[PDB]
Design a protein around this nucleic acid. Structure first.
Ligand SMILES: Cc1ncnc2nc[nH]c12
Ligand SMILES: Cc1ncnc2nc[nH]c12
Lengths: 339, 339
DNA sequence: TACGCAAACGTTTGCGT
DNA sequence: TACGCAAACGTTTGCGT
């Protein structure tokens, strides 16, 4: 029941009970035992609430995610979770779905619940959001998904999604392609706009022109893939290859080509991005840019912890790097031999 | 800063401050305002810890999951999360990975953190686990994944995974198949053993015999799929159709057939189970048993809430039902016309 | 040597008048 | 009418002797 109850059974003071429970000071064996014994019949469970209340910290972190079912997301999340656990923390998962309201919502409940730090992955960042965010500069936090350091009041991990974008395009070019298309993810997010612009650089470098009929915005969702691909192959002249903003949307596009009896890579080449755990088992095996999701996990937790325990004041940023993963969805384009 | 600070700026008592903050009693407008005003410069945030401490409840639920990246899982989880939010709760996500230790681990931190209730999805349930579980009968909890009511000390939601198993087999039979195989998920879990036995019933009913060379245990993971399928098609005589324990493993098997240049459904028919969000976009579009994941979410939260607020004492169980979803991975078998 | 007193952390709420 | 006193919730920890 309560510490009081334990001391009494133990015939010792709560001060004692508490010290033997946190080994915060020496306690006689005979003493220690008894308390243990007491603890064990009474079936005592120390109240962290009580405790947080005195010590001023909850040993609990809050992840304000965008959605958590998405392959990408899920994957990072599981990581972060692995980190909180090994280091004694507790995860409070919370998805805002990109709903400002839902965002002020969670944010507040968190503060109130007095989470030691805050992990942030909101995908898009409008001023209004960035604004709410500042209001909480007091809480240690890191934004795991910016392309640049959006603000001064936080830690940041940076994925170099542009470098990724560029890598994807190059491979395409280097494989013999010149008629390429793209189904970008929303321009309102980094992994969206950033990857696209990375891709667009390489093209310019190649004096390659992407006809706008060949550009089709996705939402990271497989249906979006499906429809984009559809819309691309559903036209007179079609690219010989396509760079797809994320693997799930990629998967999306794979199904629509199969449905038009288009052959991949034989008829259309396909490059994705993220390298989700199931990508290898796409059909065919997906060729994609791999986003280090597990470090993006770890590096964020870490930065936070630092700030948390090392009472760090200054905002810091850590870069991370994507890297090409070669599979079976891409094939040589018409200009390979001429390179 | 603190309630004290607010009352002082407000020139009113904390009792007052608190009442205007929870509208727990009438407060003069002029009064109310001021407090609000105070609250707002001081930038006050009520401490839920403090609060839980007095009121005896955290308005926070704990989900002791198995893993959270898995499609299936992820999907339910997102649901549960949607429920805690709309009803004011807070989710504590925690994966045990089927590690007893990790399981005593989380379980304890939870109690300590004094979560109002406990959602449980541990996949396998050995005595040792069931044992730890009992120790916490005090905390309201429901096990979202049993096939039957494993114990008396909990709420239970039941999926009728056997009924699902049976439905899968029937379709197979009804479509003209008699040489069928199966890549079951681990017998140590419900969704494993249960679905398999459901499938096995129908076969007996059909006087169908499954050669053990045609049975191959998976782990719900795509590689397992891959290898199982591989091992099945890699033999003299092969089934004309296969019932796969879960969609991700199914996806697993799709990739290996493609790799052996086997045609699906043209060469091999494929039935999955779960109906994950991406299943439709498998290639081809997956035919599977759909597990209501979103209700399994909702119904669990609800039961808990009940127990929670309605201080319910008796363990209750709620059934849920799977239902065939027809796609493109199955085709008529050799005996269709003869039926 | 080994242990206890009592004050505090930030709230909520029964009784008041 | 409208508001305040003070005790409590379950711990931790500075000073003790
Ligand atoms: C915002 C977002 N959503 C889903 N998958 C993604 N991959 C990269 N960014 C993503
Ligand atoms: C235990 C388990 N893991 C992953 N996917 C599943 N589908 C049903 N049960 C599953």
């Amino acid at each position: 029941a309560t510490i009081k109850d334990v001391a009494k059974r133990a015939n010792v003071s709560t001060t004692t009970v508490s010290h033997v429970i946190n080994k915060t000071r020496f306690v006689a064996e005979e003493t220690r035992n008894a308390v243990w014994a007491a603890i064990k019949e009474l079936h005592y469970s120390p109240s962290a609430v009580a405790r947080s209340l005195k010590v001023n910290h909850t040993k609990s972190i809050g992840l304000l995610a965008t959605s958590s079912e998405a392959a990408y997301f899920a994957e990072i999340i599981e990581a972060v979770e692995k980190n909180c656990f090994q280091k004694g923390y507790t995860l409070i998962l919370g998805n805002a779905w990109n709903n400002l309201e839902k965002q002020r919502a969670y944010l507040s409940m968190m503060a109130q619940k007095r989470v030691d730090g805050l992990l942030v992955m909101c995908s898009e960042y409008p001023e209004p959001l960035l604004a709410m965010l500042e209001e909480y500069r007091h809480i240690p936090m890191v934004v795991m998904d910016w392309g640049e350091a959006k603000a001064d009041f936080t830690d940041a991990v940076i994925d170099n999604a542009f470098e990724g974008g560029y890598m994807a395009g190059r491979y395409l070019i280097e494989r013999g392609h010149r008629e390429i298309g793209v189904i970008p993810g929303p321009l309102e997010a980094n992994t969206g706009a950033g990857r696209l612009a990375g891709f667009m650089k390489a093209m310019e470098e190649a004096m390659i022109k992407v006809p706008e009929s060949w550009i089709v915005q996705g939402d990271f969702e497989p249906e979006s893939g499906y429809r984009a691909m559809q819309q691309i192959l559903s036209q007179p002249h079609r690219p010989t290859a396509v760079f797809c903003g994320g693997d799930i949307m990629a998967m999306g596009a794979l199904c629509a080509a199969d449905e038009m009896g288009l052959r991949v890579p034989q008829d259309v080449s396909l490059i994705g991005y993220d390298n989700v755990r199931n990508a290898r088992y796409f059909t065919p095996a997906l060729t994609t840019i791999h986003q280090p999701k597990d470090s993006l996990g770890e590096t964020a937790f870490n930065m936070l912890l630092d700030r948390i325990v090392n009472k760090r004041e200054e905002p810091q940023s850590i870069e991370v790097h994507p890297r090409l993963i070669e599979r079976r969805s891409v094939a040589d384009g018409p200009f390979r031999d001429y390179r």
